[PDB]
PDB file of all heavy atoms in Angstrom:
ATOM      1  N   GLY J  25     -98.400-117.271 -45.676  1.00124.17           N
ATOM      2  CA  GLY J  25     -97.397-117.473 -46.716  1.00124.17           C
ATOM      3  C   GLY J  25     -97.255-116.385 -47.728  1.00124.17           C
ATOM      4  O   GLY J  25     -96.166-115.869 -47.999  1.00124.17           O
ATOM      5  N   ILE J  26     -98.370-115.966 -48.364  1.00125.94           N
ATOM      6  CA  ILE J  26     -98.414-114.780 -49.242  1.00125.94           C
ATOM      7  C   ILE J  26     -98.282-113.473 -48.494  1.00125.94           C
ATOM      8  O   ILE J  26     -97.817-112.449 -49.022  1.00125.94           O
ATOM      9  CB  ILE J  26     -99.602-114.825 -50.192  1.00125.94           C
ATOM     10  CG1 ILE J  26    -100.871-115.308 -49.513  1.00125.94           C
ATOM     11  CG2 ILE J  26     -99.276-115.724 -51.406  1.00125.94           C
ATOM     12  CD1 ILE J  26    -102.118-114.928 -50.248  1.00125.94           C
ATOM     13  N   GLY J  27     -98.716-113.416 -47.188  1.00124.21           N
ATOM     14  CA  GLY J  27     -98.479-112.236 -46.394  1.00124.21           C
ATOM     15  C   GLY J  27     -96.979-111.898 -46.226  1.00124.21           C
ATOM     16  O   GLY J  27     -96.568-110.772 -46.358  1.00124.21           O
ATOM     17  N   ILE J  28     -96.190-112.943 -45.944  1.00123.32           N
ATOM     18  CA  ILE J  28     -94.715-112.818 -45.904  1.00123.32           C
ATOM     19  C   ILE J  28     -94.193-112.471 -47.285  1.00123.32           C
ATOM     20  O   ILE J  28     -93.411-111.509 -47.434  1.00123.32           O
ATOM     21  CB  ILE J  28     -94.094-114.121 -45.340  1.00123.32           C
ATOM     22  CG1 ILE J  28     -94.343-114.252 -43.849  1.00123.32           C
ATOM     23  CG2 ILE J  28     -92.601-114.141 -45.683  1.00123.32           C
ATOM     24  CD1 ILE J  28     -93.911-115.561 -43.262  1.00123.32           C
ATOM     25  N   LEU J  29     -94.610-113.208 -48.281  1.00122.14           N
ATOM     26  CA  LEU J  29     -94.183-113.012 -49.645  1.00122.14           C
ATOM     27  C   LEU J  29     -94.556-111.603 -50.200  1.00122.14           C
ATOM     28  O   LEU J  29     -93.697-110.910 -50.739  1.00122.14           O
ATOM     29  CB  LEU J  29     -94.798-114.103 -50.535  1.00122.14           C
ATOM     30  CG  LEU J  29     -94.399-114.091 -52.013  1.00122.14           C
ATOM     31  CD1 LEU J  29     -92.969-114.504 -52.120  1.00122.14           C
ATOM     32  CD2 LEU J  29     -95.305-114.974 -52.845  1.00122.14           C
ATOM     33  N   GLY J  30     -95.815-111.201 -50.023  1.00121.01           N
ATOM     34  CA  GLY J  30     -96.291-109.910 -50.477  1.00121.01           C
ATOM     35  C   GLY J  30     -95.678-108.703 -49.726  1.00121.01           C
ATOM     36  O   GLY J  30     -95.528-107.649 -50.321  1.00121.01           O
ATOM     37  N   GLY J  31     -95.302-108.894 -48.478  1.00120.85           N
ATOM     38  CA  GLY J  31     -94.610-107.852 -47.749  1.00120.85           C
ATOM     39  C   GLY J  31     -93.220-107.559 -48.332  1.00120.85           C
ATOM     40  O   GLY J  31     -92.876-106.372 -48.559  1.00120.85           O
ATOM     41  N   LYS J  32     -92.421-108.573 -48.580  1.00124.10           N
ATOM     42  CA  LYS J  32     -91.103-108.382 -49.219  1.00124.10           C
ATOM     43  C   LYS J  32     -91.233-107.825 -50.634  1.00124.10           C
ATOM     44  O   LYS J  32     -90.331-107.107 -51.094  1.00124.10           O
ATOM     45  CB  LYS J  32     -90.342-109.715 -49.267  1.00124.10           C
ATOM     46  CG  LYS J  32     -89.806-110.116 -47.944  1.00124.10           C
ATOM     47  CD  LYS J  32     -88.803-109.063 -47.471  1.00124.10           C
ATOM     48  CE  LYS J  32     -87.789-109.604 -46.481  1.00124.10           C
ATOM     49  NZ  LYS J  32     -88.363-109.966 -45.141  1.00124.10           N
ATOM     50  N   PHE J  33     -92.308-108.158 -51.331  1.00123.41           N
ATOM     51  CA  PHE J  33     -92.603-107.426 -52.594  1.00123.41           C
ATOM     52  C   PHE J  33     -92.823-105.942 -52.406  1.00123.41           C
ATOM     53  O   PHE J  33     -92.315-105.139 -53.151  1.00123.41           O
ATOM     54  CB  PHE J  33     -93.850-108.014 -53.257  1.00123.41           C
ATOM     55  CG  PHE J  33     -94.341-107.238 -54.454  1.00123.41           C
ATOM     56  CD1 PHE J  33     -93.460-106.981 -55.496  1.00123.41           C
ATOM     57  CD2 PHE J  33     -95.615-106.676 -54.509  1.00123.41           C
ATOM     58  CE1 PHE J  33     -93.880-106.229 -56.620  1.00123.41           C
ATOM     59  CE2 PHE J  33     -96.039-105.929 -55.602  1.00123.41           C
ATOM     60  CZ  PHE J  33     -95.139-105.705 -56.657  1.00123.41           C
ATOM     61  N   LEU J  34     -93.570-105.526 -51.394  1.00122.57           N
ATOM     62  CA  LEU J  34     -93.837-104.105 -51.161  1.00122.57           C
ATOM     63  C   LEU J  34     -92.528-103.357 -50.735  1.00122.57           C
ATOM     64  O   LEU J  34     -92.349-102.192 -51.127  1.00122.57           O
ATOM     65  CB  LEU J  34     -94.906-103.869 -50.127  1.00122.57           C
ATOM     66  CG  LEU J  34     -96.310-104.273 -50.545  1.00122.57           C
ATOM     67  CD1 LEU J  34     -97.301-103.672 -49.543  1.00122.57           C
ATOM     68  CD2 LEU J  34     -96.658-103.831 -51.956  1.00122.57           C
ATOM     69  N   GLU J  35     -91.689-103.972 -49.935  1.00125.17           N
ATOM     70  CA  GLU J  35     -90.402-103.389 -49.614  1.00125.17           C
ATOM     71  C   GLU J  35     -89.500-103.284 -50.874  1.00125.17           C
ATOM     72  O   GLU J  35     -88.951-102.216 -51.169  1.00125.17           O
ATOM     73  CB  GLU J  35     -89.668-104.207 -48.553  1.00125.17           C
ATOM     74  CG  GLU J  35     -88.318-103.600 -48.188  1.00125.17           C
ATOM     75  CD  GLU J  35     -87.873-103.970 -46.782  1.00125.17           C
ATOM     76  OE1 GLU J  35     -88.610-104.694 -46.051  1.00125.17           O
ATOM     77  OE2 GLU J  35     -86.754-103.568 -46.380  1.00125.17           O
ATOM     78  N   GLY J  36     -89.371-104.385 -51.597  1.00124.67           N
ATOM     79  CA  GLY J  36     -88.682-104.356 -52.889  1.00124.67           C
ATOM     80  C   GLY J  36     -89.258-103.408 -53.910  1.00124.67           C
ATOM     81  O   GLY J  36     -88.505-102.781 -54.702  1.00124.67           O
ATOM     82  N   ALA J  37     -90.589-103.238 -53.945  1.00126.31           N
ATOM     83  CA  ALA J  37     -91.234-102.336 -54.850  1.00126.31           C
ATOM     84  C   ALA J  37     -91.009-100.877 -54.493  1.00126.31           C
ATOM     85  O   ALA J  37     -90.838-100.051 -55.381  1.00126.31           O
ATOM     86  CB  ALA J  37     -92.742-102.651 -54.901  1.00126.31           C
ATOM     87  N   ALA J  38     -91.040-100.582 -53.217  1.00125.93           N
ATOM     88  CA  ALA J  38     -90.690 -99.239 -52.728  1.00125.93           C
ATOM     89  C   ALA J  38     -89.233 -98.923 -52.965  1.00125.93           C
ATOM     90  O   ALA J  38     -88.852 -97.761 -53.208  1.00125.93           O
ATOM     91  CB  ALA J  38     -91.031 -99.123 -51.245  1.00125.93           C
ATOM     92  N   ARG J  39     -88.345 -99.930 -52.914  1.00125.68           N
ATOM     93  CA  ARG J  39     -86.968 -99.722 -53.327  1.00125.68           C
ATOM     94  C   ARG J  39     -86.830 -99.255 -54.780  1.00125.68           C
ATOM     95  O   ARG J  39     -85.988 -98.407 -55.071  1.00125.68           O
ATOM     96  CB  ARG J  39     -86.148-100.997 -53.144  1.00125.68           C
ATOM     97  CG  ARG J  39     -85.880-101.552 -51.778  1.00125.68           C
ATOM     98  CD  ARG J  39     -85.032-100.596 -50.969  1.00125.68           C
ATOM     99  NE  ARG J  39     -84.576-101.181 -49.688  1.00125.68           N
ATOM    100  CZ  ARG J  39     -85.258-101.279 -48.566  1.00125.68           C
ATOM    101  NH1 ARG J  39     -86.523-100.832 -48.538  1.00125.68           N
ATOM    102  NH2 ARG J  39     -84.720-101.846 -47.528  1.00125.68           N
ATOM    103  N   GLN J  40     -87.685 -99.711 -55.721  1.00124.01           N
ATOM    104  CA  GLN J  40     -87.357 -99.541 -57.122  1.00124.01           C
ATOM    105  C   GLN J  40     -88.572 -99.507 -58.022  1.00124.01           C
ATOM    106  O   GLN J  40     -89.095-100.548 -58.468  1.00124.01           O
ATOM    107  CB  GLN J  40     -86.435-100.671 -57.578  1.00124.01           C
ATOM    108  CG  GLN J  40     -85.023-100.786 -56.968  1.00124.01           C
ATOM    109  CD  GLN J  40     -84.119 -99.592 -57.199  1.00124.01           C
ATOM    110  OE1 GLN J  40     -84.460 -98.635 -57.918  1.00124.01           O
ATOM    111  NE2 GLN J  40     -82.931 -99.601 -56.605  1.00124.01           N
ATOM    112  N   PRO J  41     -89.049 -98.292 -58.313  1.00124.16           N
ATOM    113  CA  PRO J  41     -90.189 -98.127 -59.230  1.00124.16           C
ATOM    114  C   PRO J  41     -90.055 -98.758 -60.595  1.00124.16           C
ATOM    115  O   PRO J  41     -91.033 -99.246 -61.180  1.00124.16           O
ATOM    116  CB  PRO J  41     -90.328 -96.595 -59.331  1.00124.16           C
ATOM    117  CG  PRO J  41     -89.910 -96.096 -57.982  1.00124.16           C
ATOM    118  CD  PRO J  41     -88.704 -97.041 -57.644  1.00124.16           C
ATOM    119  N   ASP J  42     -88.850 -98.708 -61.199  1.00125.12           N
ATOM    120  CA  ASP J  42     -88.574 -99.409 -62.441  1.00125.12           C
ATOM    121  C   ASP J  42     -88.905-100.900 -62.326  1.00125.12           C
ATOM    122  O   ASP J  42     -89.516-101.474 -63.250  1.00125.12           O
ATOM    123  CB  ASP J  42     -87.084 -99.271 -62.782  1.00125.12           C
ATOM    124  CG  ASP J  42     -86.602 -97.865 -62.834  1.00125.12           C
ATOM    125  OD1 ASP J  42     -87.427 -96.919 -62.714  1.00125.12           O
ATOM    126  OD2 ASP J  42     -85.388 -97.619 -62.994  1.00125.12           O
ATOM    127  N   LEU J  43     -88.550-101.512 -61.234  1.00123.35           N
ATOM    128  CA  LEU J  43     -88.792-102.928 -60.984  1.00123.35           C
ATOM    129  C   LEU J  43     -90.209-103.335 -60.634  1.00123.35           C
ATOM    130  O   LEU J  43     -90.570-104.489 -60.884  1.00123.35           O
ATOM    131  CB  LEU J  43     -87.789-103.341 -59.914  1.00123.35           C
ATOM    132  CG  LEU J  43     -86.433-102.838 -60.363  1.00123.35           C
ATOM    133  CD1 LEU J  43     -85.329-103.395 -59.539  1.00123.35           C
ATOM    134  CD2 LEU J  43     -86.146-103.163 -61.829  1.00123.35           C
ATOM    135  N   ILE J  44     -91.063-102.419 -60.127  1.00124.20           N
ATOM    136  CA  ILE J  44     -92.387-102.860 -59.708  1.00124.20           C
ATOM    137  C   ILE J  44     -93.194-103.503 -60.818  1.00124.20           C
ATOM    138  O   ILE J  44     -93.931-104.459 -60.543  1.00124.20           O
ATOM    139  CB  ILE J  44     -93.153-101.699 -59.001  1.00124.20           C
ATOM    140  CG1 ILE J  44     -93.826-100.752 -59.959  1.00124.20           C
ATOM    141  CG2 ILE J  44     -92.180-100.965 -58.096  1.00124.20           C
ATOM    142  CD1 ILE J  44     -94.609 -99.626 -59.296  1.00124.20           C
ATOM    143  N   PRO J  45     -93.141-103.049 -62.094  1.00126.11           N
ATOM    144  CA  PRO J  45     -93.760-103.912 -63.121  1.00126.11           C
ATOM    145  C   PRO J  45     -93.050-105.212 -63.317  1.00126.11           C
ATOM    146  O   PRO J  45     -93.705-106.262 -63.459  1.00126.11           O
ATOM    147  CB  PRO J  45     -93.713-103.054 -64.403  1.00126.11           C
ATOM    148  CG  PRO J  45     -92.581-102.136 -64.216  1.00126.11           C
ATOM    149  CD  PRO J  45     -92.602-101.844 -62.743  1.00126.11           C
ATOM    150  N   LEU J  46     -91.710-105.229 -63.328  1.00126.46           N
ATOM    151  CA  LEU J  46     -90.963-106.484 -63.539  1.00126.46           C
ATOM    152  C   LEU J  46     -91.232-107.409 -62.364  1.00126.46           C
ATOM    153  O   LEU J  46     -91.507-108.608 -62.557  1.00126.46           O
ATOM    154  CB  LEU J  46     -89.491-106.184 -63.705  1.00126.46           C
ATOM    155  CG  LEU J  46     -88.677-107.495 -63.691  1.00126.46           C
ATOM    156  CD1 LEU J  46     -89.073-108.371 -64.872  1.00126.46           C
ATOM    157  CD2 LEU J  46     -87.258-107.201 -63.740  1.00126.46           C
ATOM    158  N   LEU J  47     -91.084-106.920 -61.131  1.00126.11           N
ATOM    159  CA  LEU J  47     -91.267-107.685 -59.908  1.00126.11           C
ATOM    160  C   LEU J  47     -92.703-108.169 -59.754  1.00126.11           C
ATOM    161  O   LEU J  47     -92.924-109.275 -59.202  1.00126.11           O
ATOM    162  CB  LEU J  47     -90.866-106.839 -58.705  1.00126.11           C
ATOM    163  CG  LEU J  47     -89.380-106.501 -58.589  1.00126.11           C
ATOM    164  CD1 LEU J  47     -89.155-105.429 -57.539  1.00126.11           C
ATOM    165  CD2 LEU J  47     -88.553-107.705 -58.314  1.00126.11           C
ATOM    166  N   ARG J  48     -93.689-107.427 -60.225  1.00126.63           N
ATOM    167  CA  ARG J  48     -95.080-107.888 -60.170  1.00126.63           C
ATOM    168  C   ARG J  48     -95.242-109.239 -60.870  1.00126.63           C
ATOM    169  O   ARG J  48     -96.005-110.067 -60.386  1.00126.63           O
ATOM    170  CB  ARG J  48     -95.973-106.831 -60.848  1.00126.63           C
ATOM    171  CG  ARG J  48     -97.435-107.097 -60.812  1.00126.63           C
ATOM    172  CD  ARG J  48     -98.183-106.139 -61.722  1.00126.63           C
ATOM    173  NE  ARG J  48     -98.141-104.779 -61.212  1.00126.63           N
ATOM    174  CZ  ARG J  48     -98.490-103.715 -61.919  1.00126.63           C
ATOM    175  NH1 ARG J  48     -98.871-103.833 -63.188  1.00126.63           N
ATOM    176  NH2 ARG J  48     -98.560-102.523 -61.324  1.00126.63           N
ATOM    177  N   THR J  49     -94.585-109.448 -62.017  1.00128.16           N
ATOM    178  CA  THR J  49     -94.670-110.797 -62.636  1.00128.16           C
ATOM    179  C   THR J  49     -94.129-111.851 -61.690  1.00128.16           C
ATOM    180  O   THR J  49     -94.739-112.936 -61.557  1.00128.16           O
ATOM    181  CB  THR J  49     -93.890-110.802 -63.930  1.00128.16           C
ATOM    182  OG1 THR J  49     -92.496-110.692 -63.681  1.00128.16           O
ATOM    183  CG2 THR J  49     -94.314-109.635 -64.820  1.00128.16           C
ATOM    184  N   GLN J  50     -93.024-111.618 -61.017  1.00128.65           N
ATOM    185  CA  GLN J  50     -92.466-112.577 -60.079  1.00128.65           C
ATOM    186  C   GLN J  50     -93.322-112.797 -58.852  1.00128.65           C
ATOM    187  O   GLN J  50     -93.349-113.897 -58.251  1.00128.65           O
ATOM    188  CB  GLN J  50     -91.034-112.142 -59.688  1.00128.65           C
ATOM    189  CG  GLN J  50     -90.012-112.360 -60.775  1.00128.65           C
ATOM    190  CD  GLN J  50     -89.977-113.800 -61.241  1.00128.65           C
ATOM    191  OE1 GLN J  50     -89.824-114.080 -62.421  1.00128.65           O
ATOM    192  NE2 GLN J  50     -90.098-114.716 -60.306  1.00128.65           N
ATOM    193  N   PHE J  51     -94.031-111.748 -58.383  1.00130.73           N
ATOM    194  CA  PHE J  51     -94.963-111.900 -57.262  1.00130.73           C
ATOM    195  C   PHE J  51     -96.054-112.903 -57.597  1.00130.73           C
ATOM    196  O   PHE J  51     -96.399-113.745 -56.765  1.00130.73           O
ATOM    197  CB  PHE J  51     -95.567-110.539 -56.882  1.00130.73           C
ATOM    198  CG  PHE J  51     -96.612-110.611 -55.831  1.00130.73           C
ATOM    199  CD1 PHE J  51     -96.412-111.387 -54.703  1.00130.73           C
ATOM    200  CD2 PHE J  51     -97.802-109.916 -55.923  1.00130.73           C
ATOM    201  CE1 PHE J  51     -97.365-111.470 -53.701  1.00130.73           C
ATOM    202  CE2 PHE J  51     -98.733-109.972 -54.911  1.00130.73           C
ATOM    203  CZ  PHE J  51     -98.527-110.755 -53.825  1.00130.73           C
ATOM    204  N   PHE J  52     -96.591-112.850 -58.784  1.00130.71           N
ATOM    205  CA  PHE J  52     -97.650-113.801 -59.167  1.00130.71           C
ATOM    206  C   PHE J  52     -97.102-115.247 -59.400  1.00130.71           C
ATOM    207  O   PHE J  52     -97.737-116.183 -58.966  1.00130.71           O
ATOM    208  CB  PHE J  52     -98.347-113.344 -60.455  1.00130.71           C
ATOM    209  CG  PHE J  52     -98.995-112.019 -60.350  1.00130.71           C
ATOM    210  CD1 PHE J  52     -98.936-111.115 -61.376  1.00130.71           C
ATOM    211  CD2 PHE J  52     -99.755-111.709 -59.204  1.00130.71           C
ATOM    212  CE1 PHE J  52     -99.599-109.907 -61.281  1.00130.71           C
ATOM    213  CE2 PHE J  52    -100.392-110.463 -59.084  1.00130.71           C
ATOM    214  CZ  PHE J  52    -100.312-109.558 -60.147  1.00130.71           C
ATOM    215  N   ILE J  53     -95.926-115.368 -60.020  1.00132.55           N
ATOM    216  CA  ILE J  53     -95.340-116.687 -60.170  1.00132.55           C
ATOM    217  C   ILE J  53     -95.126-117.372 -58.823  1.00132.55           C
ATOM    218  O   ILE J  53     -95.537-118.544 -58.638  1.00132.55           O
ATOM    219  CB  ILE J  53     -94.009-116.595 -60.936  1.00132.55           C
ATOM    220  CG1 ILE J  53     -94.285-116.155 -62.385  1.00132.55           C
ATOM    221  CG2 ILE J  53     -93.213-117.900 -60.827  1.00132.55           C
ATOM    222  CD1 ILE J  53     -94.858-117.236 -63.248  1.00132.55           C
ATOM    223  N   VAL J  54     -94.525-116.668 -57.866  1.00137.78           N
ATOM    224  CA  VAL J  54     -94.173-117.283 -56.595  1.00137.78           C
ATOM    225  C   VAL J  54     -95.429-117.574 -55.756  1.00137.78           C
ATOM    226  O   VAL J  54     -95.528-118.568 -55.060  1.00137.78           O
ATOM    227  CB  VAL J  54     -93.150-116.417 -55.841  1.00137.78           C
ATOM    228  CG1 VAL J  54     -92.774-117.090 -54.544  1.00137.78           C
ATOM    229  CG2 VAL J  54     -91.877-116.197 -56.700  1.00137.78           C
ATOM    230  N   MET J  55     -96.386-116.677 -55.827  1.00138.75           N
ATOM    231  CA  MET J  55     -97.699-116.858 -55.180  1.00138.75           C
ATOM    232  C   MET J  55     -98.391-118.131 -55.682  1.00138.75           C
ATOM    233  O   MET J  55     -99.025-118.850 -54.896  1.00138.75           O
ATOM    234  CB  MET J  55     -98.600-115.629 -55.465  1.00138.75           C
ATOM    235  CG  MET J  55    -100.055-115.870 -55.236  1.00138.75           C
ATOM    236  SD  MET J  55    -100.913-116.371 -56.750  1.00138.75           S
ATOM    237  CE  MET J  55    -101.556-114.817 -57.340  1.00138.75           C
ATOM    238  N   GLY J  56     -98.294-118.449 -56.974  1.00137.50           N
ATOM    239  CA  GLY J  56     -98.840-119.694 -57.495  1.00137.50           C
ATOM    240  C   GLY J  56     -98.274-120.965 -56.884  1.00137.50           C
ATOM    241  O   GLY J  56     -98.980-121.947 -56.794  1.00137.50           O
ATOM    242  N   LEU J  57     -97.012-120.935 -56.431  1.00135.97           N
ATOM    243  CA  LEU J  57     -96.465-122.115 -55.734  1.00135.97           C
ATOM    244  C   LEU J  57     -97.024-122.195 -54.302  1.00135.97           C
ATOM    245  O   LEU J  57     -97.300-123.322 -53.847  1.00135.97           O
ATOM    246  CB  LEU J  57     -94.965-122.025 -55.705  1.00135.97           C
ATOM    247  CG  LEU J  57     -94.205-122.380 -57.008  1.00135.97           C
ATOM    248  CD1 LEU J  57     -92.809-121.861 -56.963  1.00135.97           C
ATOM    249  CD2 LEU J  57     -94.285-123.834 -57.271  1.00135.97           C
ATOM    250  N   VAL J  58     -97.137-121.103 -53.599  1.00136.62           N
ATOM    251  CA  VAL J  58     -97.596-121.134 -52.194  1.00136.62           C
ATOM    252  C   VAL J  58     -99.026-121.647 -52.057  1.00136.62           C
ATOM    253  O   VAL J  58     -99.315-122.477 -51.222  1.00136.62           O
ATOM    254  CB  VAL J  58     -97.431-119.730 -51.582  1.00136.62           C
ATOM    255  CG1 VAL J  58     -98.101-119.689 -50.192  1.00136.62           C
ATOM    256  CG2 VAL J  58     -95.964-119.364 -51.395  1.00136.62           C
TER     257      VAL J  58
END
Side-chain angles (χ1 to χ4, degrees):
Chain J
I26 40 162
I28 289 173
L29 182 71
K32 286 299 205 290
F33 172 56
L34 291 193
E35 181 156 358
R39 294 295 190 278
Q40 295 300 355
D42 306 354
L43 311 190
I44 84 178
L46 173 63
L47 294 168
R48 183 192 294 168
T49 69
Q50 287 303 143
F51 176 45
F52 300 140
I53 293 287
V54 182
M55 163 267 264
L57 286 162
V58 170

